[PDB]
Amino acid sequence: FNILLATDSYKVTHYKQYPPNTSKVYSYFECREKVKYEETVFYGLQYILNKYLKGKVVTKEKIQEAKDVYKEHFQDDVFNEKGWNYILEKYDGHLPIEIKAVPEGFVIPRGNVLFTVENTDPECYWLTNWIETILVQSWYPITVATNSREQKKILAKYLLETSGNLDGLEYKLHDFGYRGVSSQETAGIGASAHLVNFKGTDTVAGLALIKKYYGTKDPVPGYSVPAAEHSTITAWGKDHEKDAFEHIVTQFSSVPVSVVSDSYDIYNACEKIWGEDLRHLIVSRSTQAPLIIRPDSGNPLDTVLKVLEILGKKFPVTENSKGYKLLPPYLRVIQGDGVDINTLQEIVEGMKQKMWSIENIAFGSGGGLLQKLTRDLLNCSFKCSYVVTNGLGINVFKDPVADPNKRSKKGRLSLHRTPAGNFVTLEEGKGDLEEYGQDLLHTVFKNGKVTKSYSFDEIRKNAQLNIELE
Amino acid sequence: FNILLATDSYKVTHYKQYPPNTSKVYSYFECREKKYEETVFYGLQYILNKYLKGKVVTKEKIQEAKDVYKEHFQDDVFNEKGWNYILEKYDGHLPIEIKAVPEGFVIPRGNVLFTVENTDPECYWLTNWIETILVQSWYPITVATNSREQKKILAKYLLETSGNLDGLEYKLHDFGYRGVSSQETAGIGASAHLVNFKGTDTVAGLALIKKYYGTKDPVPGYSVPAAEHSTITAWGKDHEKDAFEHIVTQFSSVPVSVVSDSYDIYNACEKIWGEDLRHLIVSRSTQAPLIIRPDSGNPLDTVLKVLEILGKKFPVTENSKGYKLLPPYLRVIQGDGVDINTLQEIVEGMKQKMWSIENIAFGSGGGLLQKLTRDLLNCSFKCSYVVTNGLGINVFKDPVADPNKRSKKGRLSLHRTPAGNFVTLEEGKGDLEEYGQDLLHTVFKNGKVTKSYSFDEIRKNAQLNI
Ligand SMILES: O=C(NCc1cccnc1)Nc1ccc(CN2C(=O)c3ccccc3C2=O)cc1
Numbered sequence A: 001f002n003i004l005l006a007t008d009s010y011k012v013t014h015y016k017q018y019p020p021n022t023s024k025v026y027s028y029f030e031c032r033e034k035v036k037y038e039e040t041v042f043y044g045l046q047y048i049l050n051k052y053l054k055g056k057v058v059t060k061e062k063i064q065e066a067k068d069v070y071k072e073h074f075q076d077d078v079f080n081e082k083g084w085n086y087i088l089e090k091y092d093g094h095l096p097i098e099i100k101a102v103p104e105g106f107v108i109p110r111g112n113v114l115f116t117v118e119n120t121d122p123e124c125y126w127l128t129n130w131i132e133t134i135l136v137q138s139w140y141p142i143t144v145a146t147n148s149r150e151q152k153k154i155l156a157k158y159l160l161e162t163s164g165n166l167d168g169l170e171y172k173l174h175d176f177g178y179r180g181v182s183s184q185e186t187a188g189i190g191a192s193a194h195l196v197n198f199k200g201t202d203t204v205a206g207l208a209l210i211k212k213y214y215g216t217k218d219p220v221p222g223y224s225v226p227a228a229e230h231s232t233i234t235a236w237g238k239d240h241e242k243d244a245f246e247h248i249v250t251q252f253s254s255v256p257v258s259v260v261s262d263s264y265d266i267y268n269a270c271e272k273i274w275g276e277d278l279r280h281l282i283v284s285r286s287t288q289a290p291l292i293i294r295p296d297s298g299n300p301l302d303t304v305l306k307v308l309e310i311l312g313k314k315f316p317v318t319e320n321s322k323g324y325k326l327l328p329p330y331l332r333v334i335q336g337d338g339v340d341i342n343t344l345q346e347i348v349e350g351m352k353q354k355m356w357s358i359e360n361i362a363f364g365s366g367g368g369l370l371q372k373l374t375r376d377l378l379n380c381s382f383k384c385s386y387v388v389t390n391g392l393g394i395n396v397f398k399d400p401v402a403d404p405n406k407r408s409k410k411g412r413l414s415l416h417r418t419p420a421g422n423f424v425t426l427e428e429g430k431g432d433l434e435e436y437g438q439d440l441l442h443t444v445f446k447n448g449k450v451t452k453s454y455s456f457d458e459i460r461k462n463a464q465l466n467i468e469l470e
Numbered sequence B: 001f002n003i004l005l006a007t008d009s010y011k012v013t014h015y016k017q018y019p020p021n022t023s024k025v026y027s028y029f030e031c032r033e034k035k036y037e038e039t040v041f042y043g044l045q046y047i048l049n050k051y052l053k054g055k056v057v058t059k060e061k062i063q064e065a066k067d068v069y070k071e072h073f074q075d076d077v078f079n080e081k082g083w084n085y086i087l088e089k090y091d092g093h094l095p096i097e098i099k100a101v102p103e104g105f106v107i108p109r110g111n112v113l114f115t116v117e118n119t120d121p122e123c124y125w126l127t128n129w130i131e132t133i134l135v136q137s138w139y140p141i142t143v144a145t146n147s148r149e150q151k152k153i154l155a156k157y158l159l160e161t162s163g164n165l166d167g168l169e170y171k172l173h174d175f176g177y178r179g180v181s182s183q184e185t186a187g188i189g190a191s192a193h194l195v196n197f198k199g200t201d202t203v204a205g206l207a208l209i210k211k212y213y214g215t216k217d218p219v220p221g222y223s224v225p226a227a228e229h230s231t232i233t234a235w236g237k238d239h240e241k242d243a244f245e246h247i248v249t250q251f252s253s254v255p256v257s258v259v260s261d262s263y264d265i266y267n268a269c270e271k272i273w274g275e276d277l278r279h280l281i282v283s284r285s286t287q288a289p290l291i292i293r294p295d296s297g298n299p300l301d302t303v304l305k306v307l308e309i310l311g312k313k314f315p316v317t318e319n320s321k322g323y324k325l326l327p328p329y330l331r332v333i334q335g336d337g338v339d340i341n342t343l344q345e346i347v348e349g350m351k352q353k354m355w356s357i358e359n360i361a362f363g364s365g366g367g368l369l370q371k372l373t374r375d376l377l378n379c380s381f382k383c384s385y386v387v388t389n390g391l392g393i394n395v396f397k398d399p400v401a402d403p404n405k406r407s408k409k410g411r412l413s414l415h416r417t418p419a420g421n422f423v424t425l426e427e428g429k430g431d432l433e434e435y436g437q438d439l440l441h442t443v444f445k446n447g448k449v450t451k452s453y454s455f456d457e458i459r460k461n462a463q464l465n466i
């Protein structure tokens, strides 16, 4: 990893473009104002700061390597070899940058400053926007954590309306997204961000990331259960789906087990295989070891409804204290297909309309949870707001005539909590008046060092829902 | 990196699930038939080299997996014996065989792209353990395919409006570094775009290619100097002309891309470029033009509005195909909201307004490298064949509610047909070689990469017919 090769190519050319005699470039990150995502979960910066920004990130080899690539890439000598050599000589390869950030886990309304970046040495005025590319990648854990939390709000609302409590809320949205993501690094990042709101993951990669960069009092940040896949059912032969089912439930008779039931026919598997042929191996299972029937195809809500009506006619359905239908404690369902924030809302609402409790279901989400997300969902944006040229500080911004939503903030910024509990980003250095109490941004990075860290437990507490706090 | 911790949790429990006395689990990858009629096979070599080759199992890695999984499942279900076996018998080298179509090959949907099987019966569970890591090849495949499809659109309209395909390799530039989920994804995605084009800003893609593939050229991708909002806006709202002037003067010998929408795109094209600094543009070389970059508003409407302005302030000719062409020292780049749908809308809208495609280049970020899923090409890995009690059976899924989710049966092979097209043979029928030899070469066997391809080879295989 070479930081000199970890920026957009045009940024190599930027030191020649700023006004001459520029000593300071001060930039900020926000999730611009426009399912509506009124508030965001700030998560993921600590990982970027530790893995890519801290310490001696510049060597004489990294400088020569970058110089060789750019001479070929640009078919010209644009690379600021002097500027990078200055950091190696004066700071021993440490970045003369200061990053102020809102605490990780914090839930902030859209259109507020979440972090700021500035150079601590006038010679490195160009360094502020060099590191934009790598810092803006924080849109991803921010976005995964916000959308995951938004799904938690739906799940918490419906579990409370149908059962009167939130038992098992942190295990109702499982991460199945490991194969559907673009890389091993993305898998670890995305899974850690879902782990801010939930405890269930199959993306093993996220456990190591939390352990390495955040830390938990608990041994592991995420848990899972044994489960079948199509290969372990179909491997038995079409006529032996019953034997596959029976072998798997016997092998995991004392822990919960998820068995994919749609390999040939989900309805027949529920009605005849689970409902009749092996009914005797289900009704015997413990409350702590249920069979979780997994449909994996067709219309998500239509399938969940039919599956529940089938199991209702084969197994004893009771009624909870809220008057909702409950499958016996040794029988549950998981819908791990076509699940996204939109279909999740549709299924729980469809189940509630049919008087089925949400205690009955869990959800699995892959691509919808970790991949089908973009930087534009939250309008995650990094912009220059303040510059010092010829010793004179100027408020800088953009304001495209065709898009007022692309209007950025002016000057030195600070985030504050109002007495009524609202959030305010004070522009043009107005925060120096101390009218709204202490600024919510804290220095997390300064001169190659991580100055402030957060544990995964702290993040989790900061990201808690209001329903959870009651 | 620990491969034992690089799978879906449930796959840790599968060894206890297969039929007793299973000596073989054979699986295959395909881009299931559902627009994207053919896919570019790209990216497996990166996965093979970085993650599966050599001693990937150690006593420590077994211990780390055992400790993690014990806590993860709140039960000891990890196959410690199974992995310890690979450690002792093979010195941590995976007893697996991967047969794949040559990288860069353009194959129609619903065809076997690659197969996976255990070379040792004790490792029947291994085949699907590595599904997770291998399925991630959906990403370079999908990126290379969607990039190739955009080149086909660009090829069609450039040929219609100009008469040639000059500078096609530089018409779709990569701006996606910031908008991807990680540094790894940046390198992976950018490398997959470079299979079809030469212009990238995602620097990470160059080192990946160099390390895993190789080019005769020193670099696989190129760029030009360009402004961003900060380099403009840092001059002050009253000094946008000054910013523009300084930038074009600093890069007077190379093409320079200058973002023109910081305040008013229409005024910057009409007044700043078209009047105040017009003397600094008309002097520029054909090999070093000014590239005006709008970055907001409706993509098609903004492009047409920008071109209409420049056409009034600069001399426009009518090319050999009857299409309007800006002077050679002046070009445009649309790098906002560009995906395969909007690119097609822009090139068709330009053609309709009699503007040539020689005038335009496209910049694509999130649409190029991020706004893509495994569902776009229906990328799937499934078990098609098992050997239980020494008898081989053809295995498959056939869900009642989704016939598209039906998978292939038995041992698979890929053949070239007499008409020069492709066919996937099922149930071991490929052994008869009616359409010649299997096109799937062994790329991986027992911790070894047995067959490699250079990026130049991949680029040659992925070429358009035109
Ligand atoms: O389905 C699967 N894996 C398949 C897979 C994995 C990866 C990719 N693609 C498909 N795993 C599974 C995991 C957690 C749960 C949640 N869960 C319950 O519903 C439940 C009810 C009662 C007690 C405890 C629990 C519980 O922990 C359910 C299923």
Ligand SMILES: O=C(NCc1cccnc1)Nc1ccc(CN2C(=O)c3ccccc3C2=O)cc1
Binding pocket: A008, A009, A010, B170, B171, B173, B174, B175, B176, B199, B201, B223, B224, B225, B226, B227, B255, B257, B286, B287, B288, B289, B291, B293, B331, B332, B333, B335, B360, B361, B363
């Ligand atoms: O816009 C930008 N960077 C901004 C950016 C960068 C990263 C992220 N986000 C915004 N770069 C740019 C790059 C290539 C081209 C294409 N191009 C031409 O049109 C042309 C005409 C004649 C000679 C050579 C060329 C050429 O190479 C155009 C622009």
